[PDB]
């Protein structure tokens, strides 16, 4: 019966004001909730306790730009001057005694995207299949994506300029110094590699696109 | 600084059981409780339950009764969760966290313990040298690579020229497909350096007691 419904995953410009909604099941309109922040590949962090009257207490190392407020069953997390570090999934939780046992329940989470961050455009390195792998009747094309920030990219492989979706494994982005890196692998037969004019690794980042193509053909 | 220090990553077989530990330091262990949270790979948080170390009293999410057991040892300030009868569905990161007797806030969290329930078998990688097509040979710099295909488990260690090539090296974390990891590393040198000077990638897989050195040939 104890239910937390979260505001649709939302995007905000850097420096703008964000307001997230956590909605309690109506009979639990009076309840105190907690907000959590989970940044990529890190444990959740306690943001604040937020009561029915909109009074709140923030956790260790939570800047003053996070505040909370309430209206009926609605619990709001407000972020003024939203920063890149504020990009995360924000999760609400609520505790109660139901059938004489303690229960804690989480909201499904709201993914918060911060638009207009300082941009470093990805570098691509693309490698053809090795002679050695081709001799095994197999062909892995490799696309190495580096020097980009923020971390959000997509990867598309093309064959003669058209989509190739099967046999692709693409990594999550990970930190490399103050930027990110990712990799993508396209698995073909040696026959698929020889039988096409070109293949393309196409990476989207912050509204930009970078592509790098390679050809099996001789350089004559 | 309040800290909860959890035990390291676990790779275990289905039908088996695992014990994760959560050691408290820098706060009064028995003035607070310990709760445990489950996070499946692309998913949200699932509350497992709570142990009051001072009382030994527990409360469980119904969904985990018979799956999770919470224990705490006051003499060592350590909480434990045994997961039993493990399946694919129990593969997750498990967090411990501090809470109070009378409030909901999980105010401090452990780093998390990755539990992987899998039948995956130890597999030495296939290493392939990656030279450019002729089109990528016309620059002032040249970028060579190493493909480390189909290994299990992590990690591999990769060096270039036994570590003599250190700057201009980018080693990418592995992709996982059907219980085999694949990764690639690149090294960028001046076009005057290669192929006139030898470049080799050195790949060690401690799990398999294998090492492979592949020379990059035009």
């Amino acid at each position: 019966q104890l239910v937390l419904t979260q505001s649709s995953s939302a995007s905000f410009s850097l420096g703008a004001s964000a307001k997230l909604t956590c909605t309690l099941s109506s009979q639990h309109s009076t309840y105190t909730i907690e907000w959590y922040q989970q940044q990529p590949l890190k444990p959740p962090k306690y943001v604040m306790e937020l009561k029915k009257d909109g009074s709140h207490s923030t956790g260790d190392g939570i800047p003053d730009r996070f505040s909370g407020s309430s209206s009926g069953a609605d619990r709001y997390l407000s972020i003024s001057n939203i920063q890149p570090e504020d990009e995360a999934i924000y999760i609400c939780g609520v505790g109660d005694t139901i059938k004489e046992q303690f229960v804690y329940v989480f909201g499904g989470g709201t993914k918060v995207t911060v638009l207009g961050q300082p941009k470093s455009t990805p570098t691509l390195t693309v490698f053809p299949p090795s002679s050695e792998e081709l001799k095994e009747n197999k062909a892995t094309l490799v696309c190495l994506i580096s020097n980009f920030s923020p971390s959000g990219v997509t990867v598309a492989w093309k064959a003669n300029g058209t989509p190739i979706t099967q046999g692709v494994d693409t990594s999550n982005p990970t930190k490399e110094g103050n930027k990110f890196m990712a990799s993508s692998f396209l698995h073909l037969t040696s026959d698929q590699w020889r039988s096409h004019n070109s293949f393309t690794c196409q990476v989207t980042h912050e509204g930009d696109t970078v592509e790098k193509s390679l050809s099996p053909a001789e350089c004559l | 600084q309040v800290q909860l220090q959890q035990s390291g990553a676990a790779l275990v077989r289905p039908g088996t059981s695992v014990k994760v530990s959560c050691r408290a330091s820098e706060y009064a262990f028995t003035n607070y409780v310990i709760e445990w949270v489950k996070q499946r790979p692309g998913q949200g948080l699932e509350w497992i339950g709570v142990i009051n170390p001072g009382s030994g009293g527990t409360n469980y999410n119904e969904k985990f009764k018979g799956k999770a057991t919470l224990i705490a040892d006051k003499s060592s300030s350590t909480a434990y969760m045994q997961l039993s009868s493990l399946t694919s569905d129990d593969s997750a990161v498990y967090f411990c966290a501090r809470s109070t007797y009378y409030s909901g806030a999980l105010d401090y969290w452990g780093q998390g313990t990755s539990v992987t329930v899998s039948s995956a078998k130890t597999t030495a990688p296939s290493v392939y040298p990656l030279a450019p097509v002729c089109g990528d040979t016309t620059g002032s710099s040249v970028t060579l690579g190493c493909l480390v295909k189909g290994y299990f488990p992590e990690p591999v260690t990769l060096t270039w020229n036994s570590g003599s090539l250190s700057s201009g090296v980018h080693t990418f974390p592995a992709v996982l497909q059907s219980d085999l990891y694949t990764l690639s590393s690149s090294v960028t040198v001046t076009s005057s350096t290669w192929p006139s000077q030898s470049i080799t990638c050195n790949v060690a897989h401690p799990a398999s007691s294998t090492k492979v050195d592949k020379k990059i040939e035009p």
């Binding site: 609520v94 109660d96 005694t97 303690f102 | 409360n59 009378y102």
Partner: peptide, 6 residues
């Protein structure tokens, strides 16, 4: 009302 006792 909300009651928490662990």
């Amino acid at each position: 009302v909300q009651i928490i006792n662990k």
